[PDB]
Amino acid sequence: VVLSFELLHAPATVCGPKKSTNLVKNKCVNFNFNGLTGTGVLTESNKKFL
């Protein structure tokens, strides 16, 4: 069976699940949400979302 990764100029969103693990609450850490990083206090946040 042949698996060909067609990486043209077309966007890269067909990807692999890397390391989705337990959410790190209240421990100062960076994050990797598909390409964005930053030292975050990642816990449940008090705002509305859309």
Partner: protein
């Protein structure tokens, strides 16, 4: 009715990696007083986008429609007081 003097928005649904230019488009109906679907264009311009606490659009002004357009475009406000 007409395109009312009012407010609206949109929402993304599908990523379509086309990669080629588009020339034309055509609609699909099935028939057989003033109702009509209006088609103009979109232009390489720049606008102003004011947002609320909920995170929703409220107002909008162009940059190149008029002097007021660039006035709001650069002054980074919607009140925008007098001056040069």
């Amino acid at each position: 009715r007409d395109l009312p003097q009012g407010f609206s928005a949109l929402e993304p649904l599908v990523d379509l990696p086309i990669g080629i230019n588009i020339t034309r488009f055509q609609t699909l109906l099935a028939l057989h007083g003033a109702a009509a679907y209006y088609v103009g264009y979109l232009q390489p311009r720049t606008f102003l986008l004011k947002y609320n606490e909920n995170g929703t659009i409220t107002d909008a002004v162009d940059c190149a429609l008029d002097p007021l357009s660039e006035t709001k475009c650069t002054l980074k406000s919607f009140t925008v007081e007098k001056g040069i």
